[PDB]
Amino acid sequence: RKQISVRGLAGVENVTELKKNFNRHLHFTLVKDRNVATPRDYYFALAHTVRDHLVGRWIRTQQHYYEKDPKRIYYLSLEFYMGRTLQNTMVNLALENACDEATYQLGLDMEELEEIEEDAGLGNGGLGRLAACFLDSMATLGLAAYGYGIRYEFGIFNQKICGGWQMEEADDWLRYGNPWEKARPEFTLPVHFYGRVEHTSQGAKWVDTQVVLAMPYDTPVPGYRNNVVNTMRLWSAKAPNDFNLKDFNVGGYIQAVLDRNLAENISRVLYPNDNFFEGKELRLKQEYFVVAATLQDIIRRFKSSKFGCRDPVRTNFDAFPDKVAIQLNDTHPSLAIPELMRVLVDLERLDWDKAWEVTVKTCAYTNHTVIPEALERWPVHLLETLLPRHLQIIYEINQRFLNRVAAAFPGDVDRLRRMSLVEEGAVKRINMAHLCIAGSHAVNGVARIHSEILKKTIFKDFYELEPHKFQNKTNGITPRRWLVLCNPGLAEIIAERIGEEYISDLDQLRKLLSYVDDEAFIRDVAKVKQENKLKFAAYLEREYKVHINPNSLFDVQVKRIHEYKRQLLNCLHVITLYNRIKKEPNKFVVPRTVMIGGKAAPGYHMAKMIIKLITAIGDVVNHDPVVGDRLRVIFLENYRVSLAEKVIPAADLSEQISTAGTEASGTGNMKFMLNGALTIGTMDGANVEMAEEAGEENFFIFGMRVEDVDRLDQRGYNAQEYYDRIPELRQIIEQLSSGFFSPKQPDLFKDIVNMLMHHDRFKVFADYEEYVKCQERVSALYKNPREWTRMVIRNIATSGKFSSDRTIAQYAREIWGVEPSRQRLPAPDEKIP
Amino acid sequence: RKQISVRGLAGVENVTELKKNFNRHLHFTLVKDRNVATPRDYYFALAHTVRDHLVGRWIRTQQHYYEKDPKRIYYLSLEFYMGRTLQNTMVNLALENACDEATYQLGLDMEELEEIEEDAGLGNGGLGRLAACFLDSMATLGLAAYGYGIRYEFGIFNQKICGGWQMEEADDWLRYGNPWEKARPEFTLPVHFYGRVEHTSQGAKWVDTQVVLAMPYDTPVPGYRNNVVNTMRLWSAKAPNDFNLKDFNVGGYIQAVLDRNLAENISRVLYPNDNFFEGKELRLKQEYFVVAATLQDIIRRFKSSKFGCRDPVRTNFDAFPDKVAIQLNDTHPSLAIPELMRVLVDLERLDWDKAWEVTVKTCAYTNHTVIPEALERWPVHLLETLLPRHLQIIYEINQRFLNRVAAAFPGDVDRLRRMSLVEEGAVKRINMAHLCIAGSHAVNGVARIHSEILKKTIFKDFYELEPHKFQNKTNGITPRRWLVLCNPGLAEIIAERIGEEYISDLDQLRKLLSYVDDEAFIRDVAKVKQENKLKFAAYLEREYKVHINPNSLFDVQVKRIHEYKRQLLNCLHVITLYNRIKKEPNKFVVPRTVMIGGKAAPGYHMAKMIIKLITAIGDVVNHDPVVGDRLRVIFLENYRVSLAEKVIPAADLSEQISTAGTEASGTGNMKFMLNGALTIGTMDGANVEMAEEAGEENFFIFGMRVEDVDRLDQRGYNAQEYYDRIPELRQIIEQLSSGFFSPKQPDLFKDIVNMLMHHDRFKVFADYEEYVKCQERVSALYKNPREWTRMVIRNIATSGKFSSDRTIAQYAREIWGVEPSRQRLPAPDEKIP
Ligand SMILES: OC[C@H]1O[C@H](O[C@H]2[C@H](O)[C@@H](O)[C@@H](O[C@H]3[C@H](O)[C@@H](O)[C@@H](O[C@H]4[C@H](O)[C@@H](O)[C@@H](O[C@H]5[C@H](O)[C@@H](O)[C@@H](O)O[C@@H]5CO)O[C@@H]4CO)O[C@@H]3CO)O[C@@H]2CO)[C@H](O)[C@@H](O)[C@@H]1O
Ligand SMILES: OC[C@H]1O[C@H](O[C@H]2[C@H](O)[C@@H](O)[C@@H](O[C@H]3[C@H](O)[C@@H](O)[C@@H](O[C@H]4[C@H](O)[C@@H](O)[C@@H](O[C@H]5[C@H](O)[C@@H](O)[C@@H](O)O[C@@H]5CO)O[C@@H]4CO)O[C@@H]3CO)O[C@@H]2CO)[C@H](O)[C@@H](O)[C@@H]1O
Ligand SMILES: O=P(O)(O)C[C@H]1O[C@H](CO)[C@@H](O)[C@H](O)[C@H]1O
Ligand SMILES: O=P(O)(O)C[C@H]1O[C@H](CO)[C@@H](O)[C@H](O)[C@H]1O
Ligand SMILES: O=P(O)(O)C[C@H]1O[C@H](CO)[C@@H](O)[C@H](O)[C@H]1O
Ligand SMILES: O=P(O)(O)C[C@H]1O[C@H](CO)[C@@H](O)[C@H](O)[C@H]1O
Ligand SMILES: *Cc1c(COP(=O)(O)O)cnc(C)c1O
Ligand SMILES: *Cc1c(COP(=O)(O)O)cnc(C)c1O
């Protein structure tokens, strides 16, 4: 509808420079002319002109580190959920407004072109987005940091609801190209698979291995206005030419060539599994592949440092921990630990015990869940086929480890079977979380309760052996994408009162508590959210047709569709709302639009069932005339980062409803809090630190605390109890059991009814009384709008702790041992020296 | 050693412009800086700066044709053997010398960088190079022409001789990228496979087909200094997202994604088969794929023309032949004919008989061989599975065709089984050469005897039915790559006397007969060849080590290794030479370096055997001390276009030794003739028109003419006869039979001995007397150097007829019906209008 904002300066020479370079790429890069270039061609010419302002800084940031050669942070993750890159790169370079003017005086709209860009969907959700937000934060804090992972040809599937069912389809995100990567095939590396271990004369050798090659592609990761542009290096698999062809004595020349895309399948697709574990060979291959190739790039750079010169010399890998820190995001790169031992002992010839001190001091591990089906416990027969030397290194690590445990708790023979990284049984397995605690020097959780639950439950044995290892580092979100970029209007009205230094110092938002009684600030804050609601209802009417009321409470739960996350409890609540105004049709109720969105992993039947329940409910509700427009249920299709930048600004209520003690942190919860939604949520994850930051009076907590959850388990949860005692709940179950919500096929929802009644791992009935109660308290407040905005102003004003710049400044200081910085690196300028 | 030449002007502003743009791409495109950029990075910055001078012209050449909208020539070929593109694009734009100065004053050597570029090996040999030379000629003659084919990820394999055996390896030519193509994914197209034909109400429909998508990549094809830049559009296969994923009810989400590279295998690899026929499903798929997608691009452009406006209107496909000419290179795109009928009848609803007149008038076919194992005769069961509607269209074409034949030769029932496009028998098959003659309006051969042999033997029946169809268009070579570019020194000394207009008017070389007695020209012509010999002996010493004598006759046969080409006869000759100076060690013989190079198709055992024989001979010869350096045998490894640009300038004698009546034309023979080698060859292929052009006295013809070959077949060839009567031949066979040439495994060569003796399809013994005789006559002349250079000056001076510009000016006029032109299109200059 309009905007100027402080998306930086649109100054005379630079708007001019821009338009020229735009027209240059459309011709020379695109080989398209004005009369034939479509909005996608206009998108790539600007994408190409914005990455031109980035290579100068990138090249100088990387030669800079060679010259100073800091300790280098390697963030190994198998997921990186980046979303789109043009506007984020414009924000961090301060080009937002010069390219908006430039595009204006060239007759295009930036926002049309910005919507053309495909999201890079290299992640499933929150572990992968945490990685993407960390990368922004490490560059904004001047850290010599490199994010490393796999370049998946197909990222997370694109979800389509057909007949209300999720239909998954392939994310061919590279179809039109990627202007942001730079393929580097000169730097390809081998990764060995299979083979045998010969034991001779001096050491072991892994022999007769198969060779896949690792082709790196680098993406720049620009800091917020400080001229640092760090790197995301993502490996692609390529078959070699000699073995992947020559091994002879008949078998088809064409067949040997077509069989190459079988080694290259290692990076074809991301595994789409939310908090579950799949013991598939292709996954362990992907896990070894990014470990092997990355550790070679690590050592290469450590062998230059300045030791490839001197500092001492006579290859002292002693200094390896003072030059390298490798962060394992979840156990997916836990083979970084046996592999660092392999290259150091086998290839580099250090003694076991030196190379162990060097491995534990450079590695650290971030635990992401306590739900036991998520734990990777790879069967031993898999590892002996695929990685026979690494298995060997794991057995010797385990041997030596349990010798520590038995020394320290002598005689405690059941502790020994519990702490072992080898899980005995029918299928002998390797417990990778155990590997990670044995070979890292810092193990951390993602939120204070999740960190305490690790010390007290899941890893109490390891905590008693080595209390010094366990840490907590509560998650964060980046203020640049999650505020500046999806909510420019909220950021400009904050910018107006307190300035802009808060975008890399979010704790400053607390100076906003002075304006909680300002009537100009209250009205502005509230107009921004009504505007946001209004542009999203438009988006919905446009891209997905639907039409909703902008004057309702926009109640939204968006995250992956898992039972512990409790889209079902939320569901039960909206079926109640419906039933209550059907009983009393002519009662005023605060009108609300409830929007649930998220993806199910392919073969998770319950999750596919819940998406069918939600769309089945909106089939009844959205078509009942007595309901009018007072209640609408919208399933939000193909949830991902660009849609989260659209929804979370338009939200009034944020559903963070998991059973206490299951969500380790959550980060969706933090994003909604700096964007002026109010939380309704259990004392779970970081919801506890958020309520603690704003004050419990300003948050809408309900439900069972974790102590009450264990008490109910001690007792035994009996869901028939809640059904019997609560008539509104009984009525809802029967409606489900009789086909009220599935007419032409009445027994349709009997899997979900049977579960809630008899197999509810997450206790949905136990929290239903206190949940519809709490929900009556947000509607009470909604219709006292000035007092909702003042509660909102106290949530927004207390979001500081949930910046990823604070989380990274604490890993930096207490795990990696580097000091952050914000001194901007010298200006982009020219010089080829 | 030095050069200035007339590689155009190196003028002040433009050398300056160049260096700046070089440094621009190395930074912004390459993201490499001077201190870290290798010679490959320097190659891509110049490749990128030379294609910058080409997009202006390309875009304006293509909008130009839209505006004037000529008849458009579509050259459909499954092979296109382009070799490398930088220097060829510099020649045609006149940038050779500005970029040589530019690179000089930047401290690099062009020739180092020019050697970095990978050859685009999208062809096997001569059919594919003919296509590549035609494209140059069509752009140099201002024709609205488009070359269409498949973009193979792997081209022709790279050959490596290990233990003297060919080892084939994959040509991953795209590893480092291609700076010359422009991917156009917005223009992807579907190609249907499998399915069924429903017959209902109005017409047939091909239903339940599988869908592969065709992703086009365009390469510019610049004319010689006339600002036309035409297009090579090459299709790539891409799996769709919906069917290649959704078809459900359990079967693995990861499996559905990994199974996509199975539709994309259609463009993975070129079939490496020289004049043979493989009836494999993947080949017919590749053949339908480039036909389907191309015919859609043809019709699209015919539906704009100006009829998508008017000219008449009420969709008159009548004018289709006056707007389109599609040339089928060999029978590999013969499905262009049933497919043009399918879209016109089934989709476009014309009557059969209108659409047949429109198909025969737009299609034309070039026959490339008479050797019967080369003929594609696709089994009927293959086509009914894969293309069931097309099979149907072929049966109805055949029905209607034989009704013409039987009307015109009433009662001649064996003619009817001979002319049928359906070859009855155990495996019923479709004769594709027959398809092509029924549905083209011009059928042509590639040289005057090959054209006569078609009218008299292989296609006499079709010639009697339709004499008007049969034509001849003798092959050509492009004077720009095959003279200007690999022989700048020979081109500058010609340029000195007669000027340079000969590079697009090669017939002008005849004004060189005036200098056949010029002693300055004789000495220059001879110094150029000694220089060339000297740089190739260096190349050999460098890249392949070998060391040879530059003062010998460089005797070279380079082409594919097939029995009809007769690398064995040449072999028998060098074993004789060896034996003769072993008999008489101290006889002066003219010293010669014999170089045989070329690739065998993978499973062609005889061809793999002949490469082993040749390297086995050089094992004896190159190590015999009594031989001294008087004779050396060099097998020329990994023969291809860039090596042919190195060898053919350095050649003194050119071996064009096939059994008369088998090589249809040959083009290697023409390249050697404009580069000052003298031919020894049978009266075969275009060797007959070449001898005829220079005078038989100036050529070294020997051997059986084709009449003598049929006489010997009438009689029955008995190779024991030649063995018995010729002692030098008897001695050679015994040396082979006893392991003289294969010591540690004596029976090694008994496949080749057994064949020559009992199964010689190509009569190698029949031509051996006259061949070692003719070979004594070139050595006689070699050691009268001034009289060799004067014979050479009469071959070079009479090469005009063998330009591809003459061949294309005759297809243009007598088959496609367009007039060539040489008026340069307006200067590249600016304007976005
Ligand atoms: O060359 C060095 C070394 O080699 C040899 O030892 C190696 C073993 O031969 C090899 O099999 C491998 O051993 C693994 C073992 O395979 C694996 O099962 C695992 O065993 C653990 C259990 O996982 C753990 O639960 C616990 O089990 C006990 C438990 O205390 C007890 O309470 C009861 O419940 O059952 C079990 C029986 O006591 O402990 C065991 C180990 O005690 O871990 C092993 C080590 O990873 O690797 C060995 C090291 O390379 C030679 O035998 C040895 O002498 C040489 O020093
Ligand atoms: O709906 C239109 C049309 O449909 C029906 O005809 C179709 C046929 O049913 C269908 O099978 C197909 O016919 C093909 C035939 O399958 C194929 O074998 C081929 O036959 C040729 C031989 O290839 C050729 O050698 C020659 O063979 C004769 C030969 O003259 C003779 O000397 C002796 O040696 O042997 C053979 C027996 O006489 O000629 C035959 C054809 O005479 O070609 C056929 C046509 O392509 O396609 C038909 C057309 O769609 C109905 O039968 C018909 O009435 C309708 O008009
Ligand atoms: O992986 P490396 O070698 O440390 C970093 C690579 O990218 C940097 C930024 O483009 C270049 O300065 C460097 O020369 C290049 O090799
Ligand atoms: O599987 P999810 O929820 O997308 C992501 C998981 O990792 C995130 C980042 O550590 C946590 O905040 C979240 O609680 C945890 O369940
Ligand atoms: O295949 P088409 O559409 O005929 C030719 C294509 O390339 C030409 C040269 O870049 C462009 O002018 C044209 O707009 C484009 O669509
Ligand atoms: O298989 P080859 O020899 O490489 C190529 C084939 O097509 C060429 C181009 O029409 C002919 O000149 C040649 O005689 C013929 O055998
Ligand atoms: C931040 C984010 C998540 C995380 O959601 P939680 O509520 O923490 O589970 C998942 N998906 C996307 C698209 C995100 O933006
Ligand atoms: C021209 C050429 C050919 C053709 O050789 P012929 O002697 O006609 O069989 C084959 N390969 C390459 C590399 C060529 O340059």
From Swiss-Prot, chains A, B:
The record marks 146 as: Can be labeled by an AMP analog. The modification Phosphoserine is found at residues 5, 420, 504, 737-738. GO terms for cellular component: skeletal muscle myofibril. The modification N6-(pyridoxal phosphate)lysine is found at residue 671. Phosphorylation of Ser-5 converts phosphorylase B (unphosphorylated) to phosphorylase A. GO terms for molecular function: glycogen phosphorylase activity; nucleotide binding; pyridoxal phosphate binding. It is an enzyme of class 2 (transferase). Gene3D superfamilies: Glycogen Phosphorylase B. AMP binds at residues 33, 66, 300-309. The record marks 99, 133 as: Involved in the association of subunits. The modification Phosphotyrosine is found at residues 194, 217, 463. Its cofactor is pyridoxal 5'-phosphate. It catalyses: [(1->4)-alpha-D-glucosyl](n) + phosphate = [(1->4)-alpha-D-glucosyl](n-1) + alpha-D-glucose 1-phosphate. Allosterically regulated through the non-covalent binding of metabolites, being activated by AMP and inhibited by ATP, ADP, and glucose-6-phosphate. The activity is also controlled by post-translational modifications including phosphorylation. One of its GO terms (biological process) is glycogen catabolic process. The keyword Nucleotide-binding applies. Its EC number is 2.4.1.1. Keywords: Acetylation, Allosteric enzyme, Carbohydrate metabolism, Glycogen metabolism, Glycosyltransferase, Nucleotide-binding, Phosphoprotein, Pyridoxal phosphate, Transferase. Pfam families: Phosphorylase. Allosteric enzyme that catalyzes the rate-limiting step in glycogen catabolism, the phosphorolytic cleavage of glycogen to produce glucose-1-phosphate, and plays a central role in maintaining cellular and organismal glucose homeostasis. Belongs to the glycogen phosphorylase family. Homodimer. Homotetramer; to form the enzymatically active phosphorylase A. This is Glycogen phosphorylase, muscle form. The lineage of its organism: Eukaryota, Metazoa, Chordata, Craniata, Vertebrata.
